[PDB]
Design a protein around this ligand. Structure first.
Ligand SMILES: O=C(O)COc1cc(Cl)ccc1-c1ccc(C(=O)O)c(NS(=O)(=O)c2ccc(-c3ccccc3)cc2)c1
Ligand SMILES: [Cl-]
Lengths: 237, 233
């Protein structure tokens, strides 16, 4: 194929352990998620993968996943670009709640609506939210215009602010011949997959990307996948 | 009063900091990683904040930068890596200890190399065990034939570094970005020489400590307004 693209979704965070919604909250990897990242890097290493540029979010679970990979494949000297546009979905008011508090507070029907809807956002994170300032006033977002910093996001929203970065920053790089590695989050990566494969909103809702596993696309010169996405690792995983 | 912070990596594997590690991509030792860790803790306890970091393409410095940024919770910061911040290239001596250098070249020539600002050591030849390792390394495949050193005098190292300073770090400092620089002894020495307008003999005298934030306060023209400062006990 003309081009090769590798994506990796970060692994288990500290907050997955507590069953808490992270979104834009900057949770670090759990030890186990760190190990997933190591296994993924080892898979790239064993397959002799080489990259020229790396993209990731401004969230430390994705950034650390990237570091761990670059270490495994002995390519820590690569340029790395970080952007909020690759951030996890902003879960708004649900940020910091766990599963139980959320089901108790909103009921099964409303939670099903949130999980199954493509353009239904969860409640906005209001200024009295425990993490309002921790997130909304983090200087790493100082450069965002008033309307780019979200209070909550549907999947459509997350994909809408991620795809501009794909089209304007990564695509040019792929067409330049640069081998690209994107280390990010399930939902912004969902956006990229939906675009690459022209999936329906229904299909993309069905799709969950495996964590800590390198996801290889062989693409033609128009960035059209020449075959289904493949994973790297041992025969088991 | 602009604030600029420099840090020099610590000990590398297999004693290579005492074997002219140079352009060989030696990793930090556990001890050297701990050194970076303390440097980061000190930067945190003092609440330092940066807006952009520069480093070399050598992993001991890259890992020092990673470790600092971890400790200070600023892993989201933009990072620029450039071979111009690379350690001095010690040519054929790369990998040799003091004794082996003396055996192979003589005390007289070794002392001259120590004290000389513009005398390079012998080139690293194709029979050197690191020759293809370094010179055929993908990370340098964008350098011109005249850019990829086979050896370097201190002058060569500083000459190759200062263009990156001028063309890339200074503009960030002027726009007010708080710059952090993680690199190596001799590339940091070039920067210090340019800051403090030092002499050849002076910079060859200067010996920057490792694992310890070095702090400058600059003015609208980027001249230091006090001696450098060190963060710790
Ligand atoms: O895209 C994503 O990020 C993931 O999807 C979501 C998106 C948003 Cl914004 C918010 C939440 C989810 C989400 C969150 C939690 C769960 C979960 O495990 O609790 C889940 N799974 S569920 O099948 O739909 C489900 C099934 C049964 C109940 C139930 C409630 C009350 C009593 C008894 C049962 C609740 C939820 C989905
Ligand atoms: Cl980085």
């Amino acid at each position: 194929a003309a081009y090769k693209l590798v994506l990796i979704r970060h692994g288990e965070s500290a907050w997955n352990l507590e069953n808490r919604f992270s979104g834009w909250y900057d949770a670090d990897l759990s030890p186990a998620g760190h190990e997933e990242a190591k296994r993924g890097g080892q898979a790239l290493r064993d397959a002799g993968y080489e990259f020229d540029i790396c993209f990731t979010s401004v969230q430390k679970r994705a950034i650390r996943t990237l570091w761990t990979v670059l270490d495994a494949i002995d390519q820590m000297w690569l340029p790395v670009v970080r952007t909020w546009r690759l951030n996890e979905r902003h879960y708004g008011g649900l940020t910091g709640l766990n599963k139980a508090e959320t089901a108790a507070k909103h009921g099964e029907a409303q939670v099903k609506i949130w999980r199954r809807s493509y353009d239904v956002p969860p409640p906005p994170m209001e200024p009295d939210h425990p993490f309002y300032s921790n997130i909304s006033k983090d200087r790493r977002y100082a450069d965002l215009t008033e309307d780019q910093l979200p209070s909550c996001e549907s999947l459509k929203d997350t994909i809408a602010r991620a795809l501009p970065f794909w089209n304007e920053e990564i695509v040019p790089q792929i067409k330049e011949g640069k081998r690209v590695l994107i280390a990010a989050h399930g939902n912004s990566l969902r956006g990229i997959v939906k675009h690459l494969e022209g999936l329906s909103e229904e299909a993309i809702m069905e799709l969950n990307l495996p964590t800590g596993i390198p996801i290889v696309y062989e693409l033609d010169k128009n960035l059209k996948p020449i075959k289904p996405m493949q994973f790297l690792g041992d025969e088991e995983t």
